[PDB]
């Protein structure tokens, strides 16, 4: 039993019924999936992302990601239709809560000169998205087994209906906001 | 002055330029010429206009330029290139 999931249905599940006037317990917001992709656009030349962007998100998240192909061909990028350009993993269930636990506790507050994450980054539904700068804090990867740096951006998808409804869900989970 | 026996070096005219500005809420930029003054760990967040020979260049001391001289941020040789 992961510790953030049991803490979710201990006080977070109850605190939102007082802050927001829900009549039913089925209206309570909950994060459903967390999506992490690299998006290695420097893979249209020499095609070296198999060792790079696959063997690290397998170490960060816990399951091997999906090599994604291009939809159409754009000439200014040397990008042909049917060429690996992005690498995406999807986290559900126990591995979702154990990724957000390892993110907020030890990974996210060790960015160099970290002053929070912007609370203006909600889409209009209640789904949150931020980015990272480099092959990040995540201690499962080391310098002995990495190539060049690459960044990721992380989608957090909740069942909330509006922005502050989903912002208040992520406050109790442990996302910092400035 | 570069040795750890007489501390860092700041010119005496650089400091006392302000006397009664604790109570009228201003952050006035310093029109200075002393390029040789070491940025000690007390100029943090302030600003300076450093004379590079022909004009004054605005530098903003953030936190990480705390071991360098003040003149290292106004270059004195213009060089766009040969061709």
């Amino acid at each position: 039993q992961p510790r953030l999931k049991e803490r979710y249905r201990s006080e977070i599940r109850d605190a939102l019924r007082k802050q927001f006037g829900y009549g039913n317990v089925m209206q309570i917001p909950t994060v459903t999936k967390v999506v992490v992709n690299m998006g290695v656009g420097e893979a249209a030349r020499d095609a070296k992302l198999i060792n790079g962007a696959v063997n690290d998100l397998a170490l960060i998240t816990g399951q091997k990601p999906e090599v994604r192909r291009a939809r159409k061909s754009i000439a200014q990028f040397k990008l042909r239709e049917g060429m690996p350009v992005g690498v995406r993993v999807t986290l559900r269930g126990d591995r979702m809560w154990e990724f957000l636990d390892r993110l907020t506790s030890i990974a996210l507050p060790r960015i160099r000169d970290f002053r929070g994450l912007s609370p203006k980054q909600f889409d209009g539904v209640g789904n949150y998205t931020f980015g990272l700068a480099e092959q990040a804090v995540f201690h499962e990867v080391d310098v002995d087994k990495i190539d060049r740096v690459r960044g990721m951006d992380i989608n957090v998808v909740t069942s909330a209906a509006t922005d502050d409804e989903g912002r208040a869900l992520l406050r109790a989970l442990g996302f910092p906001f400035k | 002055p570069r040795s750890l026996k007489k501390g860092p070096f700041v010119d005496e005219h650089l400091l006392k330029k302000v006397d009664v500005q604790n109570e009228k809420n201003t952050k006035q930029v310093i029109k200075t010429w002393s390029r040789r003054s070491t940025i000690i760990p007390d100029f943090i967040g302030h600003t300076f206009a450093v004379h590079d020979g022909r004009k004054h260049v605005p530098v903003f001391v953030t936190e990480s330029m705390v071991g360098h001289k003040l003149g290292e941020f106004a270059p004195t040789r213009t060089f766009k290139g040969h061709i």
Binding site: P2, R3, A58, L59, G62, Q63, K64, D94, R95, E98, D101, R102, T104, S105, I106, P109, R110, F114, R115, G116, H139, E140, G174, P176, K178 | V10, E12, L14, L15, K16, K17, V18, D19, V20, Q21, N22, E23, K24, N25, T26, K27, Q28, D42, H46
Partner: protein
């Protein structure tokens, strides 16, 4: 496909230099993940010009 493709993912205990510790599940080989700053011993989680004249005058 949830068989012999994904890497090994077993229990792992994390400790901090402050003393905060908890138990999670990650791909660290051996359960020996070591941090030196965590979510409770970090800043942002717990918090005129005449000062020129005050120092050397």
């Amino acid at each position: 496909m949830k068989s012999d493709i994904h890497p090994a993912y077993e229990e792992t205990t994390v400790v901090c230099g402050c003393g905060n510790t908890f138990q999670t599940r990650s791909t660290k080989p051996g359960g020996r993940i070591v941090v030196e700053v965590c979510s409770q011993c970090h800043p942002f989680y717990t918090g005129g010009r005449v000062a020129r004249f005050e120092k050397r005058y």
